[PDB]
Amino acid sequence: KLPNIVILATGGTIAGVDTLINAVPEVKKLANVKGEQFSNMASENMTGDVVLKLSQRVNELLARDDVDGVVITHGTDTVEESAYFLHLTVKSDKPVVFVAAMRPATAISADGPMNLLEAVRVAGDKQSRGRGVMVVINDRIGSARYITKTNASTLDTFRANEEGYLGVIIGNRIYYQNRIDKLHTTRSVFDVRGLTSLPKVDILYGYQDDPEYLYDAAIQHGVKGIVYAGMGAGSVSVRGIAGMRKALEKGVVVMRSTRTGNGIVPPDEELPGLVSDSLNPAHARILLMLALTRTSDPKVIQEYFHTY
Amino acid sequence: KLPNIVILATGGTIAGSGVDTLINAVPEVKKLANVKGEQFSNMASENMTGDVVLKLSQRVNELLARDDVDGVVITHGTDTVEESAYFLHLTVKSDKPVVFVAAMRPATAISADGPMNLLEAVRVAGDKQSRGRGVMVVINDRIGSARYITKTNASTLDTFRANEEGYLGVIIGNRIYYQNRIDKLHTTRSVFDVRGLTSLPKVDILYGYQDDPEYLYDAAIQHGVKGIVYAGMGAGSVSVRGIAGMRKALEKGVVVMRSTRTGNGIVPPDEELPGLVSDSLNPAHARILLMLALTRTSDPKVIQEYFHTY
Amino acid sequence: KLPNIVILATGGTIAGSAALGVDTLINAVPEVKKLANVKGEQFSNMASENMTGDVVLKLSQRVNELLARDDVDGVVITHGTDTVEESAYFLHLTVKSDKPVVFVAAMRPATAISADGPMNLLEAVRVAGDKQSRGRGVMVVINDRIGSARYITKTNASTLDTFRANEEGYLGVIIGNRIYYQNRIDKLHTTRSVFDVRGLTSLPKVDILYGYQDDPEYLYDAAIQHGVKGIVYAGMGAGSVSVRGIAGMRKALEKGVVVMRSTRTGNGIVPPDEELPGLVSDSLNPAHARILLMLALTRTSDPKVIQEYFHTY
Amino acid sequence: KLPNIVILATGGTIAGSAATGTALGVDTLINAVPEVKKLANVKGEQFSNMASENMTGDVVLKLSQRVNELLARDDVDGVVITHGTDTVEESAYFLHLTVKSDKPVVFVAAMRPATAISADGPMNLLEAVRVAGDKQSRGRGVMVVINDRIGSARYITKTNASTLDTFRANEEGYLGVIIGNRIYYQNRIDKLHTTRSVFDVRGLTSLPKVDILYGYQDDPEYLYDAAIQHGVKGIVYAGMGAGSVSVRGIAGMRKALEKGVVVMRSTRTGNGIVPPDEELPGLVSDSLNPAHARILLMLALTRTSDPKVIQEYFHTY
Ligand SMILES: N[C@@H](CC(=O)O)C(=O)O
Ligand SMILES: N[C@@H](CC(=O)O)C(=O)O
Ligand SMILES: N[C@@H](CC(=O)O)C(=O)O
Numbered sequence A: 001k002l003p004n005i006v007i008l009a010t011g012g013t014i015a016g017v018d019t020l021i022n023a024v025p026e027v028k029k030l031a032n033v034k035g036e037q038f039s040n041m042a043s044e045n046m047t048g049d050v051v052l053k054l055s056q057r058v059n060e061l062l063a064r065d066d067v068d069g070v071v072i073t074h075g076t077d078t079v080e081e082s083a084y085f086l087h088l089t090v091k092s093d094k095p096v097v098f099v100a101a102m103r104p105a106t107a108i109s110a111d112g113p114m115n116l117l118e119a120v121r122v123a124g125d126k127q128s129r130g131r132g133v134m135v136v137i138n139d140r141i142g143s144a145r146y147i148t149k150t151n152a153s154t155l156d157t158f159r160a161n162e163e164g165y166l167g168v169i170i171g172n173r174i175y176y177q178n179r180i181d182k183l184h185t186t187r188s189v190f191d192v193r194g195l196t197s198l199p200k201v202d203i204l205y206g207y208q209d210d211p212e213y214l215y216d217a218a219i220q221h222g223v224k225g226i227v228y229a230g231m232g233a234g235s236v237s238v239r240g241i242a243g244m245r246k247a248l249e250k251g252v253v254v255m256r257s258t259r260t261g262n263g264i265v266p267p268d269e270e271l272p273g274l275v276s277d278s279l280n281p282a283h284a285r286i287l288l289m290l291a292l293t294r295t296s297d298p299k300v301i302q303e304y305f306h307t308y
Numbered sequence B: 001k002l003p004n005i006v007i008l009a010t011g012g013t014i015a016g017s018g019v020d021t022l023i024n025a026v027p028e029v030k031k032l033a034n035v036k037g038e039q040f041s042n043m044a045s046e047n048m049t050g051d052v053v054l055k056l057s058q059r060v061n062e063l064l065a066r067d068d069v070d071g072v073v074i075t076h077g078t079d080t081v082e083e084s085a086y087f088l089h090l091t092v093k094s095d096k097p098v099v100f101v102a103a104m105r106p107a108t109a110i111s112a113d114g115p116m117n118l119l120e121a122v123r124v125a126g127d128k129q130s131r132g133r134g135v136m137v138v139i140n141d142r143i144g145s146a147r148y149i150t151k152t153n154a155s156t157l158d159t160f161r162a163n164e165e166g167y168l169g170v171i172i173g174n175r176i177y178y179q180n181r182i183d184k185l186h187t188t189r190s191v192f193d194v195r196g197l198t199s200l201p202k203v204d205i206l207y208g209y210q211d212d213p214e215y216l217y218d219a220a221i222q223h224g225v226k227g228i229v230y231a232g233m234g235a236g237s238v239s240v241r242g243i244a245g246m247r248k249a250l251e252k253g254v255v256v257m258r259s260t261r262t263g264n265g266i267v268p269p270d271e272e273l274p275g276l277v278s279d280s281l282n283p284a285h286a287r288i289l290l291m292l293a294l295t296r297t298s299d300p301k302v303i304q305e306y307f308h309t310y
Numbered sequence C: 001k002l003p004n005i006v007i008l009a010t011g012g013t014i015a016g017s018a019a020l021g022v023d024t025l026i027n028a029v030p031e032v033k034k035l036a037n038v039k040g041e042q043f044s045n046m047a048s049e050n051m052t053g054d055v056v057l058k059l060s061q062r063v064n065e066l067l068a069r070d071d072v073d074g075v076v077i078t079h080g081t082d083t084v085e086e087s088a089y090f091l092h093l094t095v096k097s098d099k100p101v102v103f104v105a106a107m108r109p110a111t112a113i114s115a116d117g118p119m120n121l122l123e124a125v126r127v128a129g130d131k132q133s134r135g136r137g138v139m140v141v142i143n144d145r146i147g148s149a150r151y152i153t154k155t156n157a158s159t160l161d162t163f164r165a166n167e168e169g170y171l172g173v174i175i176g177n178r179i180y181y182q183n184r185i186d187k188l189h190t191t192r193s194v195f196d197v198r199g200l201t202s203l204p205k206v207d208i209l210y211g212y213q214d215d216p217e218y219l220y221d222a223a224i225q226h227g228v229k230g231i232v233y234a235g236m237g238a239g240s241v242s243v244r245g246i247a248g249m250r251k252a253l254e255k256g257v258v259v260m261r262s263t264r265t266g267n268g269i270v271p272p273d274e275e276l277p278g279l280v281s282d283s284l285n286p287a288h289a290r291i292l293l294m295l296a297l298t299r300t301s302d303p304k305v306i307q308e309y310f311h312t313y
Numbered sequence D: 001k002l003p004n005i006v007i008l009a010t011g012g013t014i015a016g017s018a019a020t021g022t023a024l025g026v027d028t029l030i031n032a033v034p035e036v037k038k039l040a041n042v043k044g045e046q047f048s049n050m051a052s053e054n055m056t057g058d059v060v061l062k063l064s065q066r067v068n069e070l071l072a073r074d075d076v077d078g079v080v081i082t083h084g085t086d087t088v089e090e091s092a093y094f095l096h097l098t099v100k101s102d103k104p105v106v107f108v109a110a111m112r113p114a115t116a117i118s119a120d121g122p123m124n125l126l127e128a129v130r131v132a133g134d135k136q137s138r139g140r141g142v143m144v145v146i147n148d149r150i151g152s153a154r155y156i157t158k159t160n161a162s163t164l165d166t167f168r169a170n171e172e173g174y175l176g177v178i179i180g181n182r183i184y185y186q187n188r189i190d191k192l193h194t195t196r197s198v199f200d201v202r203g204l205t206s207l208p209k210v211d212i213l214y215g216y217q218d219d220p221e222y223l224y225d226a227a228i229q230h231g232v233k234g235i236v237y238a239g240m241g242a243g244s245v246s247v248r249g250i251a252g253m254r255k256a257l258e259k260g261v262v263v264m265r266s267t268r269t270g271n272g273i274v275p276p277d278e279e280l281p282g283l284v285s286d287s288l289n290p291a292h293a294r295i296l297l298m299l300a301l302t303r304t305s306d307p308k309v310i311q312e313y314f315h316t317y
């Protein structure tokens, strides 16, 4: 009866992998679980080269006939970045479910145990296939493309204000609500098998008195892309625009996102750079880095931003 | 009979295709108040700068000192209204209403929001019950505190929200409904005296994200910044590279303030990390309070206390 | 060639003044004529609080007929905000077409300063005429948002941004004259729905009873005595029932009335609980639950079949 | 000196015990969070032990009188009330109107039973005790503390059937939050409550009867008749939109008013303002939801049946 699920641990407040498994032995009634310790770091230290390797490992795991799904334990701070990277790069319809905890395993009313039990339920459910990469936490199933950590510190921090959840887990039952209307996983062009490094992309904030010199510094340190976390709908001050023009003059791809938290940065013929659609800055950086593995053609990169 | 309101125009999409053109388009405002328009500036708010917001604050302070001004409405772009409004929230030494207003659609647009926004803002500014509430941002039938309200969406009419703090009030059916008073210091109780000042200590904002680079901290230090606000991962969590950058800044006397990129909530104290914490201030609000904090002191404990009280 | 869109008007504040015919709404936003070849048809002209099942049934049947024509590519239905979620979910279950069906409404009357209706209607016509809008289920378009009829609800008495689906989000948004589609609903609707209402002229009676401290058994008695076929309970919490409500429900079940337990809370799942009477409404709110229950009772009174509809529609 | 906090237990899922991790007395709640001893000197008192869907006005009245008695004592600094989540908003708003003290009254609840994996009640209870015992918490009105949030009784509502984060005040936010063992107070409510409320229920043992009727397509007039015949003193209408009323509902309302029943138009929508409309029967609920509006109406009817006086209470409380 039971699905074969690998729990691949990377670190996080949620935390070895076998302690997490033995600490929530109820997972063993939902799936035949095998723990693998991939890494053990706080997610604020997760790096692209490690995420690239995580993607390659999960691709290897899901190519096996004896693996039905993977649960990846991770820190909450950057789970949206790791999850979106896998969303673009894992070429399987078998479920990939990131899980995390906002309270440490030792805290009163720690959320990790239930989050993990939910994540294993989701990863093992046959109805979970072909949905894109998911983040499960606090009874919710979020798409990697939409979900984001919206609050510094609360248990219900992961939300997608405009897109909602793919599903919810209540009373030990999964309720699937939406399928994302975007490309991912088995329909994505972002194959990264045997890449070993990724194009450098920095994120610069927009705000009153924002300085041009941060652009100059990024250019000088060899960035290939800049994601702008812009005022409003990717609006730019005279200083930012001077900086973006310098970047473009020097061969950098400029992507205008928003610092607001939500919503669409629309095309604008009268401003430099590309536009991020509804990708926030963290997600935009991940798609831009992957885009630059394939192309430097701004029309092609822009169309990825509208479709992924 | 009527309240005397000054409409001080700074620019923004609310005036997008003069202040008297905005007034003449909403002649209904004249039944709520005796309005006078003044054109302070005309710029998109992405170009608003501290030096200009200083002048704005000084002008509004001057106006509110006058018997013949009951309140001020400030028309502004949406993109950085939260920054301008929080600056005035900290520096305007009057209990008379100061109401920032804006529009997400240009004045020419089908179902443009500016006309009703402006009428609501004039109602709020003239209402006797509006006194002593701190600076306000009025848009889309909502009254937001300058300390909590933020532009949460790039493009929608209902973008201004304070998810955890709610609205001070709402305007429905031509009546104001006051819900909350902010439990923070502001306006007449503020220490932030900016009379005589013409510029402000330099503070930049650096983002937190996977692979964030140390060299941006170096660049900021080299350019003479007095403060760095960090728009951190999670609860102001810092990578190894960020910590290195922050330790370099602290050694050079830069005040480092850890906020969050998430959008909401509390960055709690953590003695094992560098720098101060931003309480519930988002990075744009944190920059504004940190610049004003540095007009009084560089002492980290004093600044941290401002951050827990303003 | 522009899409051919019928604008079917039913009333609402969108046509209110401080009433207006469909051609006036159209002519107040002449931009709609650049997006589509529009034909206005006045179906009704009432406030939506007065919209009734028998009329919604006729609306559905008319829209079904229209969308079977080769010269109609989609329909926009102007309606009051107050019960648009009920009309829209009814059509979502009963219109057997993939062509777009887009309800639109306005929170401010047409005469109001910064009236919302003009942009709402333009957006609605854009949505209805886009080929990418096909096969999505019935939609409610307002305030730059495209809500599924199955999830969207009026969440605020009085604001422009009242239509939200907190847990399910929007199907799409309309920004800068462009449609951004985000989600497809994972539920049955329209061309995959079993709820055929061709030929019908009336629907089984279903009332909604509220749950709250001191809630009285006598409202159950009254509904039962008046011949209701179903009772939707707008329950405390997750369809929780007081001793009085349980007494009332057991009376109803004795008389063959189908009891459906929803929630007054506004959102989320009422889970199965074999210890309590009645069926459970999944994530359907009470207004939506009533619409699905009325239609279910046209086909079955088997509680298991009804329960499965509530988990799949 | 630590504050003296009474934990007054009334039931709820916070005190629930299921078969497995996928009824309880107060001292069991207290003993599962021994950390509470460092925040306060706590004493447990068992007021009731029921599911909150069974809480009744007559018992809520007794609860308020007990809390009033407790807070009059010098040796009581604050009270925490453990309760079911389903009608906590009703009991809390009742006390918010009738507790004549500035000392903290903090309702607390839990969405998962005590036996559940990652049960929320232990931390909810600790946070409620911290809030009740903090000197900064006085004079804030009655509070509901759950999931790191401090909600005013006047605004807070259960918005979701089943999630941990269900308690929200979408338009009014939280009074405060509790993060890292520290309280952050954000707002003071701009409404009358507690020591400034006219609603004294010291002598009473019951309240005027008020029922709630829903608004929806095809809503039936006969439920108005039924209510009137069962002796209601008020009807709260959970109306369509902004308290909009069908022709059937208007006929029902008019019959109610003829019989001296006070009709209060609220909204089913979940949030926002039901504005005055002289063209419609009855009064309007301001931003009070139906459950809150019923509580205020019952208390209003202990003092007056003057619709003007009742309307003004609804704009001020
Ligand atoms: N800093 C932690 C926070 C968490 O997991 O809640 C991490 O991201 O590893
Ligand atoms: N970029 C404009 C946007 C607006 O006002 O909606 C501004 O901030 O001036
Ligand atoms: N009562 C009106 C309100 C609206 O349309 O906004 C209706 O539903 O017809």
Ligand SMILES: N[C@@H](CC(=O)O)C(=O)O
Pocket (backbone or CB within 6 Å): C237, C240, D011, D012, D013, D014, D050, D051, D052, D053, D083, D084, D085, D086, D087, D109, D110, D111, D112
């Ligand atoms: N039905 C329970 C639900 C809860 O406590 O969460 C009660 O309200 O007592």
